Design a protein around this ligand. Sequence first.
Ligand SMILES: NC(=O)C1=CN([C@@H]2O[C@H](COP(=O)(O)OP(=O)(O)OC[C@H]3O[C@@H](n4cnc5c(N)ncnc54)[C@H](OP(=O)(O)O)[C@@H]3O)[C@@H](O)[C@H]2O)C=CC1
Length: 452
Amino acid sequence: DRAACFLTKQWSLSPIGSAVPGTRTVAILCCQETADLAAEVSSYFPNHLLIDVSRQSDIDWKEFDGLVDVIGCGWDDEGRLDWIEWVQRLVEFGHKEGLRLLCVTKGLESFQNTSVRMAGASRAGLYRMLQCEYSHLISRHMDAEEVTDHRRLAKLIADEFYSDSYDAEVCYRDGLRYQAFLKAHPETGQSAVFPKDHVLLITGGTRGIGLLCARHFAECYGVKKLVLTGREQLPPREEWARFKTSNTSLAEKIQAVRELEAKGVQVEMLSLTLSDDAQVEQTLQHIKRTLGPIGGVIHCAGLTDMDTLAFIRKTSDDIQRVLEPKVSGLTTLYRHVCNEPLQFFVLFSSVSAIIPELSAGQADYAMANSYMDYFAEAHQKHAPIISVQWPNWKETGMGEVTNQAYRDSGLLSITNSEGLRFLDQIVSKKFGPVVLPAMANQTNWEPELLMK
Ligand SMILES: NC(=O)C1=CN([C@@H]2O[C@H](COP(=O)(O)OP(=O)(O)OC[C@H]3O[C@@H](n4cnc5c(N)ncnc54)[C@H](OP(=O)(O)O)[C@@H]3O)[C@@H](O)[C@H]2O)C=CC1
Protein backbone atom coordinates (compact mmCIF):
# COMPACT_ATOMS: atom_id res chain seq x y z
CA ASP A 1 0.00 0.00 0.00
CA ARG A 2 1.92 2.96 -1.38
CA ALA A 3 0.94 6.58 -0.61
CA ALA A 4 -1.23 8.31 2.05
CA CYS A 5 -3.27 11.37 1.18
CA PHE A 6 -6.24 13.28 2.60
CA LEU A 7 -8.80 14.58 0.10
CA THR A 8 -11.45 17.22 0.57
CA LYS A 9 -14.12 18.56 -1.77
CA GLN A 10 -13.05 21.71 -3.60
CA TRP A 11 -14.63 23.83 -6.34
CA SER A 12 -13.59 25.31 -9.65
CA LEU A 13 -15.36 27.36 -12.32
CA SER A 14 -17.39 25.25 -14.77
CA PRO A 15 -19.33 27.53 -17.13
CA ILE A 16 -22.34 26.17 -19.10
CA GLY A 17 -21.71 26.20 -22.90
CA SER A 18 -25.27 25.98 -24.33
CA ALA A 19 -28.80 25.57 -22.92
CA VAL A 20 -31.13 24.15 -25.55
CA PRO A 21 -34.75 23.65 -24.45
CA GLY A 22 -36.92 20.61 -25.24
CA THR A 23 -40.71 20.26 -25.37
CA ARG A 24 -41.26 16.98 -23.51
CA THR A 25 -42.79 17.14 -20.02
CA VAL A 26 -40.58 17.99 -17.07
CA ALA A 27 -41.77 16.79 -13.67
CA ILE A 28 -41.37 19.24 -10.82
CA LEU A 29 -41.10 17.61 -7.38
CA CYS A 30 -42.02 19.87 -4.50
CA CYS A 31 -43.81 20.05 -1.14
CA GLN A 32 -46.22 22.61 0.37
CA GLU A 33 -43.27 24.78 1.40
CA THR A 34 -41.57 24.85 -2.01
CA ALA A 35 -44.74 25.17 -4.16
CA ASP A 36 -44.32 28.87 -4.95
CA LEU A 37 -40.76 28.20 -6.10
CA ALA A 38 -42.06 25.23 -8.08
CA ALA A 39 -44.66 27.48 -9.79
CA GLU A 40 -41.91 29.94 -10.79
CA VAL A 41 -39.76 27.11 -12.15
CA SER A 42 -42.83 25.83 -14.02
CA SER A 43 -43.01 29.04 -16.14
CA TYR A 44 -39.77 27.97 -17.90
CA PHE A 45 -41.30 24.60 -18.86
CA PRO A 46 -44.39 25.01 -21.10
CA ASN A 47 -44.91 21.25 -20.69
CA HIS A 48 -44.65 20.21 -17.00
CA LEU A 49 -46.16 18.18 -14.21
CA LEU A 50 -46.08 19.63 -10.67
CA ILE A 51 -45.80 16.77 -8.20
CA ASP A 52 -46.51 18.09 -4.71
CA VAL A 53 -45.65 15.12 -2.48
CA SER A 54 -47.82 16.40 0.43
CA ARG A 55 -50.95 15.88 -1.77
CA GLN A 56 -50.81 7.40 -7.63
CA SER A 57 -48.41 6.94 -10.66
CA ASP A 58 -50.64 6.68 -13.81
CA ILE A 59 -48.00 8.62 -15.82
CA ASP A 60 -46.76 8.03 -19.41
CA TRP A 61 -43.15 8.18 -18.14
CA LYS A 62 -41.62 7.76 -21.64
CA GLU A 63 -42.96 11.21 -22.64
CA PHE A 64 -40.75 13.00 -20.03
CA ASP A 65 -37.50 14.99 -20.53
CA GLY A 66 -36.75 14.70 -16.84
CA LEU A 67 -37.43 15.92 -13.39
CA VAL A 68 -36.53 18.94 -11.29
CA ASP A 69 -36.55 18.28 -7.50
CA VAL A 70 -36.84 21.45 -5.33
CA ILE A 71 -37.86 19.78 -2.05
CA GLY A 72 -34.26 20.37 -0.88
CA CYS A 73 -34.94 24.14 -1.09
CA GLY A 74 -37.36 23.83 1.88
CA TRP A 75 -37.29 21.91 5.17
CA ASP A 76 -36.94 18.52 3.49
CA ASP A 77 -38.09 16.02 6.12
CA GLU A 78 -35.43 13.24 6.24
CA GLY A 79 -38.07 10.75 7.54
CA ARG A 80 -40.51 11.24 4.63
CA LEU A 81 -39.43 8.92 1.81
CA ASP A 82 -42.50 9.15 -0.49
CA TRP A 83 -40.61 11.31 -2.98
CA ILE A 84 -38.30 8.38 -3.70
CA GLU A 85 -40.85 6.31 -5.61
CA TRP A 86 -41.44 9.17 -8.10
CA VAL A 87 -37.71 9.21 -8.89
CA GLN A 88 -37.56 5.38 -9.11
CA ARG A 89 -40.50 5.16 -11.50
CA LEU A 90 -39.13 7.89 -13.79
CA VAL A 91 -35.71 6.21 -13.77
CA GLU A 92 -37.13 2.77 -14.58
CA PHE A 93 -39.94 3.67 -16.95
CA GLY A 94 -38.59 6.80 -18.65
CA HIS A 95 -37.02 7.10 -22.10
CA LYS A 96 -33.66 5.31 -22.42
CA GLU A 97 -32.09 7.90 -24.78
CA GLY A 98 -31.47 10.56 -22.18
CA LEU A 99 -33.50 12.02 -19.39
CA ARG A 100 -32.41 14.60 -16.81
CA LEU A 101 -32.61 14.57 -13.06
CA LEU A 102 -31.76 17.80 -11.22
CA CYS A 103 -31.82 18.22 -7.45
CA VAL A 104 -31.70 21.79 -6.17
CA THR A 105 -30.67 22.78 -2.68
CA LYS A 106 -30.05 26.18 -1.06
CA GLY A 107 -26.88 26.83 0.94
CA LEU A 108 -26.13 23.17 1.56
CA GLU A 109 -22.46 23.42 0.39
CA SER A 110 -19.85 25.16 2.55
CA PHE A 111 -18.11 26.72 -0.47
CA GLN A 112 -18.30 30.56 -0.18
CA ASN A 113 -20.93 30.00 2.48
CA THR A 114 -20.27 30.67 6.13
CA SER A 115 -23.59 29.02 7.16
CA VAL A 116 -24.51 25.49 5.88
CA ARG A 117 -28.30 25.07 5.63
CA MET A 118 -28.83 21.41 6.55
CA ALA A 119 -31.61 20.50 4.08
CA GLY A 120 -31.30 18.13 1.10
CA ALA A 121 -28.19 16.29 2.35
CA SER A 122 -29.29 12.68 1.75
CA ARG A 123 -31.13 13.58 -1.45
CA ALA A 124 -28.04 15.40 -2.89
CA GLY A 125 -26.05 12.20 -2.48
CA LEU A 126 -28.59 10.21 -4.53
CA TYR A 127 -28.75 12.63 -7.47
CA ARG A 128 -24.94 12.92 -7.53
CA MET A 129 -24.62 9.24 -8.33
CA LEU A 130 -27.66 8.06 -10.31
CA GLN A 131 -26.00 8.64 -13.68
CA CYS A 132 -23.26 6.16 -12.67
CA GLU A 133 -25.85 3.43 -11.96
CA TYR A 134 -28.04 4.16 -15.00
CA SER A 135 -26.07 4.91 -18.15
CA HIS A 136 -29.09 6.59 -19.87
CA LEU A 137 -29.51 9.30 -17.18
CA ILE A 138 -28.00 12.72 -16.72
CA SER A 139 -28.21 13.37 -12.96
CA ARG A 140 -27.00 16.39 -10.99
CA HIS A 141 -27.02 18.07 -7.62
CA MET A 142 -27.11 21.91 -7.83
CA ASP A 143 -26.66 24.13 -4.79
CA ALA A 144 -27.90 27.70 -5.04
CA GLU A 145 -27.28 30.46 -2.60
CA GLU A 146 -29.74 30.85 0.25
CA VAL A 147 -30.27 34.53 -0.63
CA THR A 148 -31.30 33.76 -4.22
CA ASP A 149 -34.72 35.12 -5.06
CA HIS A 150 -37.27 32.61 -6.57
CA ARG A 151 -37.42 34.40 -9.95
CA ARG A 152 -33.63 34.43 -10.31
CA LEU A 153 -33.41 30.85 -9.00
CA ALA A 154 -36.03 29.59 -11.54
CA LYS A 155 -33.94 31.06 -14.38
CA LEU A 156 -30.73 29.44 -13.10
CA ILE A 157 -32.62 26.15 -12.74
CA ALA A 158 -33.99 26.13 -16.29
CA ASP A 159 -30.58 26.89 -17.84
CA GLU A 160 -28.93 24.24 -15.69
CA PHE A 161 -31.53 21.60 -16.52
CA TYR A 162 -31.14 22.01 -20.28
CA SER A 163 -27.36 22.57 -20.13
CA ASP A 164 -24.68 20.68 -22.04
CA SER A 165 -23.14 19.48 -18.76
CA TYR A 166 -22.58 16.06 -17.30
CA ASP A 167 -21.16 17.44 -14.02
CA ALA A 168 -22.35 15.44 -10.98
CA GLU A 169 -22.32 18.36 -8.58
CA VAL A 170 -22.34 22.11 -9.01
CA CYS A 171 -23.02 25.28 -7.08
CA TYR A 172 -23.77 28.88 -7.91
CA ARG A 173 -22.05 31.66 -6.02
CA ASP A 174 -22.52 35.30 -7.03
CA GLY A 175 -23.95 34.19 -10.40
CA LEU A 176 -20.99 31.94 -11.22
CA ARG A 177 -21.20 28.18 -11.72
CA TYR A 178 -18.66 25.90 -9.97
CA GLN A 179 -18.15 22.12 -10.12
CA ALA A 180 -17.09 19.93 -7.20
CA PHE A 181 -13.96 17.79 -7.30
CA LEU A 182 -11.66 16.04 -4.80
CA LYS A 183 -8.17 17.30 -4.06
CA ALA A 184 -5.38 16.63 -1.52
CA HIS A 185 -6.10 18.76 1.49
CA PRO A 186 -4.50 22.15 1.14
CA GLU A 187 -1.69 22.26 3.60
CA THR A 188 -1.70 19.22 5.80
CA GLY A 189 -2.22 16.20 3.55
CA GLN A 190 0.20 17.24 19.86
CA SER A 191 -2.83 15.13 20.86
CA ALA A 192 -4.38 15.95 24.27
CA VAL A 193 -4.94 13.35 27.01
CA PHE A 194 -8.35 11.64 27.18
CA PRO A 195 -9.60 12.19 30.77
CA LYS A 196 -9.58 8.99 32.85
CA ASP A 197 -12.96 9.74 34.42
CA HIS A 198 -14.64 10.29 31.00
CA VAL A 199 -16.32 7.73 28.78
CA LEU A 200 -15.61 6.88 25.14
CA LEU A 201 -18.92 6.05 23.46
CA ILE A 202 -18.70 3.94 20.31
CA THR A 203 -21.88 3.10 18.38
CA GLY A 204 -21.36 -0.04 16.31
CA GLY A 205 -18.52 -0.74 18.78
CA THR A 206 -19.29 -4.40 19.31
CA ARG A 207 -17.55 -5.79 16.22
CA GLY A 208 -15.78 -4.74 13.05
CA ILE A 209 -13.98 -1.43 12.83
CA GLY A 210 -15.71 0.05 15.87
CA LEU A 211 -14.39 -2.73 18.09
CA LEU A 212 -10.96 -2.22 16.55
CA CYS A 213 -11.24 1.46 17.54
CA ALA A 214 -12.27 0.38 21.08
CA ARG A 215 -9.10 -1.72 21.47
CA HIS A 216 -6.99 1.08 20.02
CA PHE A 217 -8.28 3.84 22.31
CA ALA A 218 -7.93 1.58 25.37
CA GLU A 219 -4.33 0.78 24.37
CA CYS A 220 -2.98 4.09 22.98
CA TYR A 221 -5.15 6.85 24.52
CA GLY A 222 -5.48 5.26 28.01
CA VAL A 223 -9.28 5.13 27.89
CA LYS A 224 -10.66 3.62 31.12
CA LYS A 225 -14.41 3.62 30.38
CA LEU A 226 -15.98 2.32 27.16
CA VAL A 227 -19.61 2.05 26.17
CA LEU A 228 -19.96 -0.05 23.03
CA THR A 229 -23.39 -0.08 21.37
CA GLY A 230 -25.08 -2.19 18.72
CA ARG A 231 -28.40 -3.93 18.14
CA GLU A 232 -27.93 -7.30 19.85
CA GLN A 233 -28.74 -7.55 23.54
CA LEU A 234 -26.09 -9.68 25.24
CA PRO A 235 -27.36 -12.15 27.83
CA PRO A 236 -26.73 -11.49 31.57
CA ARG A 237 -23.09 -11.83 32.67
CA GLU A 238 -23.88 -15.00 34.69
CA GLU A 239 -24.58 -16.84 31.39
CA TRP A 240 -21.24 -15.94 29.78
CA ALA A 241 -19.21 -18.98 30.82
CA ARG A 242 -21.32 -21.21 28.49
CA PHE A 243 -19.90 -19.35 25.44
CA LYS A 244 -16.17 -20.30 25.86
CA THR A 245 -16.12 -22.80 22.95
CA SER A 246 -18.77 -21.17 20.84
CA ASN A 247 -17.78 -19.86 17.38
CA THR A 248 -20.72 -17.45 17.19
CA SER A 249 -20.62 -13.70 16.77
CA LEU A 250 -22.13 -13.44 20.27
CA ALA A 251 -19.32 -15.59 21.71
CA GLU A 252 -16.76 -13.26 20.09
CA LYS A 253 -18.44 -10.21 21.62
CA ILE A 254 -18.32 -11.72 25.11
CA GLN A 255 -14.65 -12.63 24.57
CA ALA A 256 -13.89 -9.09 23.38
CA VAL A 257 -15.49 -7.58 26.53
CA ARG A 258 -13.29 -9.84 28.59
CA GLU A 259 -10.09 -8.83 26.72
CA LEU A 260 -10.86 -5.14 27.17
CA GLU A 261 -11.65 -5.68 30.86
CA ALA A 262 -8.24 -7.39 31.21
CA LYS A 263 -6.56 -4.11 30.10
CA GLY A 264 -8.19 -2.47 33.21
CA VAL A 265 -11.11 -0.86 31.31
CA GLN A 266 -14.74 -0.70 32.54
CA VAL A 267 -16.78 -1.87 29.53
CA GLU A 268 -20.50 -1.94 28.82
CA MET A 269 -21.82 -3.50 25.63
CA LEU A 270 -25.40 -2.26 25.10
CA SER A 271 -28.29 -2.63 22.70
CA LEU A 272 -29.56 0.83 21.72
CA THR A 273 -32.04 1.94 19.06
CA LEU A 274 -30.25 5.16 18.13
CA SER A 275 -33.31 6.70 16.45
CA ASP A 276 -35.41 6.15 19.63
CA ASP A 277 -35.31 9.44 21.51
CA ALA A 278 -36.61 8.00 24.83
CA GLN A 279 -34.09 5.10 24.85
CA VAL A 280 -31.11 7.29 23.89
CA GLU A 281 -32.00 9.83 26.67
CA GLN A 282 -32.45 7.10 29.27
CA THR A 283 -29.27 5.25 28.25
CA LEU A 284 -27.21 8.49 28.23
CA GLN A 285 -28.53 9.36 31.68
CA HIS A 286 -27.52 5.89 32.90
CA ILE A 287 -23.97 6.36 31.52
CA LYS A 288 -23.60 9.85 33.06
CA ARG A 289 -24.95 8.69 36.42
CA THR A 290 -22.91 5.48 36.74
CA LEU A 291 -19.74 5.85 34.59
CA GLY A 292 -19.10 9.53 33.99
CA PRO A 293 -19.29 12.33 31.45
CA ILE A 294 -18.86 11.52 27.71
CA GLY A 295 -15.36 12.57 26.52
CA GLY A 296 -15.66 11.25 22.96
CA VAL A 297 -17.94 9.63 20.42
CA ILE A 298 -17.19 7.39 17.44
CA HIS A 299 -20.24 6.71 15.29
CA CYS A 300 -19.70 3.36 13.53
CA ALA A 301 -23.30 2.05 13.64
CA GLY A 302 -24.11 1.17 10.03
CA LEU A 303 -25.51 -1.33 7.57
CA THR A 304 -25.07 -1.98 3.86
CA ASP A 305 -27.99 -3.60 2.00
CA MET A 306 -26.22 -6.54 0.28
CA ASP A 307 -29.40 -8.28 -1.01
CA THR A 308 -31.03 -5.54 -3.21
CA LEU A 309 -28.59 -3.59 -5.29
CA ALA A 310 -30.59 -1.86 -8.01
CA PHE A 311 -31.97 1.56 -6.80
CA ILE A 312 -35.21 0.98 -8.73
CA ARG A 313 -35.77 -2.37 -6.95
CA LYS A 314 -35.42 -0.99 -3.38
CA THR A 315 -38.54 -0.32 -1.27
CA SER A 316 -38.98 2.60 1.14
CA ASP A 317 -38.62 0.18 4.01
CA ASP A 318 -35.28 -1.25 2.72
CA ILE A 319 -33.97 2.27 2.31
CA GLN A 320 -35.18 3.45 5.73
CA ARG A 321 -33.29 0.57 7.40
CA VAL A 322 -30.02 1.65 5.79
CA LEU A 323 -30.58 5.32 6.64
CA GLU A 324 -31.71 4.76 10.25
CA PRO A 325 -28.33 4.50 12.06
CA LYS A 326 -26.68 7.22 10.04
CA VAL A 327 -29.50 9.76 9.66
CA SER A 328 -32.20 9.60 12.37
CA GLY A 329 -29.76 7.75 14.65
CA LEU A 330 -27.01 10.31 14.27
CA THR A 331 -29.39 13.24 14.77
CA THR A 332 -30.91 11.76 17.90
CA LEU A 333 -27.52 10.79 19.38
CA TYR A 334 -26.16 14.29 18.68
CA ARG A 335 -29.06 16.00 20.47
CA HIS A 336 -28.25 14.03 23.64
CA VAL A 337 -24.42 14.32 23.60
CA CYS A 338 -23.71 17.72 22.02
CA ASN A 339 -23.38 19.45 25.43
CA GLU A 340 -20.97 16.79 26.80
CA PRO A 341 -17.24 17.65 27.12
CA LEU A 342 -16.36 15.94 23.81
CA GLN A 343 -12.77 15.89 22.53
CA PHE A 344 -14.03 14.46 19.24
CA PHE A 345 -17.16 13.14 17.55
CA VAL A 346 -16.07 11.01 14.58
CA LEU A 347 -18.52 9.76 11.94
CA PHE A 348 -17.70 6.67 9.89
CA SER A 349 -18.82 7.67 6.42
CA SER A 350 -17.53 6.20 3.15
CA VAL A 351 -15.92 7.00 -0.16
CA SER A 352 -19.31 5.90 -1.55
CA ALA A 353 -20.81 9.09 -0.08
CA ILE A 354 -18.87 11.14 -2.61
CA ILE A 355 -17.33 9.06 -5.45
CA PRO A 356 -20.31 8.35 -7.72
CA GLU A 357 -18.70 5.35 -9.46
CA LEU A 358 -18.43 3.58 -6.06
CA SER A 359 -21.99 4.54 -5.01
CA ALA A 360 -23.48 2.35 -7.82
CA GLY A 361 -25.52 -0.63 -6.60
CA GLN A 362 -25.73 0.95 -3.13
CA ALA A 363 -27.57 4.22 -3.53
CA ASP A 364 -29.21 4.18 -0.05
CA TYR A 365 -25.78 3.70 1.60
CA ALA A 366 -24.50 6.72 -0.37
CA MET A 367 -27.51 8.72 0.82
CA ALA A 368 -26.92 7.69 4.45
CA ASN A 369 -23.22 8.53 4.45
CA SER A 370 -23.78 11.75 2.50
CA TYR A 371 -26.13 12.96 5.26
CA MET A 372 -23.34 12.46 7.84
CA ASP A 373 -20.91 14.50 5.74
CA TYR A 374 -23.21 17.50 5.64
CA PHE A 375 -24.22 17.01 9.27
CA ALA A 376 -20.57 17.47 10.33
CA GLU A 377 -20.22 20.58 8.13
CA ALA A 378 -23.42 22.05 9.61
CA HIS A 379 -22.43 21.37 13.28
CA GLN A 380 -18.66 21.94 13.20
CA LYS A 381 -19.17 25.26 15.06
CA HIS A 382 -20.96 23.52 17.98
CA ALA A 383 -18.94 20.30 18.38
CA PRO A 384 -15.58 18.69 17.40
CA ILE A 385 -17.39 16.66 14.77
CA ILE A 386 -15.72 15.13 11.73
CA SER A 387 -17.06 12.87 9.03
CA VAL A 388 -14.50 10.47 7.61
CA GLN A 389 -15.17 9.11 4.15
CA TRP A 390 -13.37 5.82 4.65
CA PRO A 391 -12.17 3.62 1.81
CA ASN A 392 -12.57 -0.14 2.12
CA TRP A 393 -10.87 -1.75 5.15
CA LYS A 394 -9.18 -4.91 3.98
CA GLU A 395 -8.71 -6.78 7.31
CA THR A 396 -11.80 -6.13 9.49
CA GLY A 397 -15.49 -5.13 9.35
CA MET A 398 -17.62 -5.82 6.24
CA GLY A 399 -14.27 -6.87 4.63
CA GLU A 400 -13.40 -6.23 0.97
CA VAL A 401 -15.05 -8.21 -1.89
CA THR A 402 -14.16 -5.07 -3.94
CA ASN A 403 -15.41 -4.57 -7.48
CA GLN A 404 -13.92 -3.29 -10.76
CA ALA A 405 -14.93 0.38 -10.15
CA TYR A 406 -13.06 0.32 -6.83
CA ARG A 407 -9.97 -1.21 -8.46
CA ASP A 408 -10.34 1.22 -11.41
CA SER A 409 -10.68 4.17 -9.01
CA GLY A 410 -7.04 3.59 -7.94
CA LEU A 411 -8.14 3.47 -4.33
CA LEU A 412 -6.45 0.75 -2.36
CA SER A 413 -8.06 -1.23 0.41
CA ILE A 414 -6.44 -0.24 3.75
CA THR A 415 -4.96 -2.30 6.59
CA ASN A 416 -6.18 -1.87 10.20
CA SER A 417 -2.89 -0.19 11.05
CA GLU A 418 -3.24 2.24 8.09
CA GLY A 419 -6.78 3.02 9.21
CA LEU A 420 -5.93 3.64 12.85
CA ARG A 421 -3.02 5.94 11.89
CA PHE A 422 -5.43 7.77 9.61
CA LEU A 423 -7.87 8.13 12.52
CA ASP A 424 -5.20 9.42 14.90
CA GLN A 425 -4.13 12.07 12.40
CA ILE A 426 -7.72 13.13 11.70
CA VAL A 427 -8.39 13.64 15.41
CA SER A 428 -5.01 15.42 16.07
CA LYS A 429 -5.24 17.81 13.10
CA LYS A 430 -7.69 20.17 11.50
CA PHE A 431 -8.47 18.61 8.17
CA GLY A 432 -11.87 20.33 8.54
CA PRO A 433 -15.24 18.69 9.04
CA VAL A 434 -15.09 16.21 6.14
CA VAL A 435 -12.08 14.24 4.93
CA LEU A 436 -11.42 11.26 2.69
CA PRO A 437 -8.22 9.47 3.77
CA ALA A 438 -6.83 7.21 1.04
CA MET A 439 -3.95 4.93 0.35
CA ALA A 440 -3.20 5.18 -3.32
CA ASN A 441 -0.69 3.75 -5.74
CA GLN A 442 0.59 7.23 -6.56
CA THR A 443 1.70 6.34 -10.08
CA ASN A 444 -1.91 5.77 -11.34
CA TRP A 445 -3.87 8.23 -9.22
CA GLU A 446 -5.87 11.18 -10.38
CA PRO A 447 -7.98 12.36 -7.45
CA GLU A 448 -9.23 15.32 -9.48
CA LEU A 449 -11.01 12.97 -11.87
CA LEU A 450 -12.63 10.83 -9.17
CA MET A 451 -15.96 12.65 -9.33
CA LYS A 452 -16.18 12.75 -13.17
N1 LIG B 1 -15.81 -2.12 6.40
C1 LIG B 1 -15.46 -1.11 5.60
O1 LIG B 1 -14.61 -1.27 4.74
C2 LIG B 1 -16.08 0.26 5.70
C3 LIG B 1 -16.96 0.62 6.72
N2 LIG B 1 -17.50 1.85 6.80
C4 LIG B 1 -18.42 2.18 7.89
O2 LIG B 1 -17.80 1.85 9.14
C5 LIG B 1 -18.78 1.42 10.08
C6 LIG B 1 -18.40 0.06 10.63
O3 LIG B 1 -18.16 -0.81 9.54
P1 LIG B 1 -17.96 -2.37 9.75
O4 LIG B 1 -17.03 -2.55 10.91
O5 LIG B 1 -17.65 -2.95 8.40
O6 LIG B 1 -19.41 -2.83 10.22
P2 LIG B 1 -19.79 -4.27 10.83
O7 LIG B 1 -21.00 -4.80 10.12
O8 LIG B 1 -18.57 -5.14 11.00
O9 LIG B 1 -20.30 -3.78 12.26
C7 LIG B 1 -21.51 -3.04 12.33
C8 LIG B 1 -21.66 -2.58 13.75
O10 LIG B 1 -22.70 -1.61 13.82
C9 LIG B 1 -23.78 -2.15 14.57
N3 LIG B 1 -25.03 -1.77 13.90
C10 LIG B 1 -25.42 -2.09 12.65
N4 LIG B 1 -26.62 -1.52 12.38
C11 LIG B 1 -27.00 -0.82 13.47
C12 LIG B 1 -28.16 0.01 13.87
N5 LIG B 1 -29.19 0.22 13.02
N6 LIG B 1 -28.16 0.55 15.11
C13 LIG B 1 -27.14 0.36 15.98
N7 LIG B 1 -26.07 -0.39 15.69
C14 LIG B 1 -25.94 -0.98 14.47
C15 LIG B 1 -23.57 -3.65 14.66
O11 LIG B 1 -24.21 -4.16 15.83
P3 LIG B 1 -24.78 -5.67 15.89
O12 LIG B 1 -23.53 -6.49 15.81
O13 LIG B 1 -25.55 -5.72 17.17
O14 LIG B 1 -25.66 -5.78 14.66
C16 LIG B 1 -22.06 -3.70 14.68
O15 LIG B 1 -21.54 -3.39 15.98
C17 LIG B 1 -20.11 1.37 9.33
O16 LIG B 1 -20.88 2.53 9.69
C18 LIG B 1 -19.73 1.40 7.87
O17 LIG B 1 -20.72 2.02 7.04
C19 LIG B 1 -17.21 2.79 5.90
C20 LIG B 1 -16.34 2.56 4.83
C21 LIG B 1 -15.69 1.27 4.64
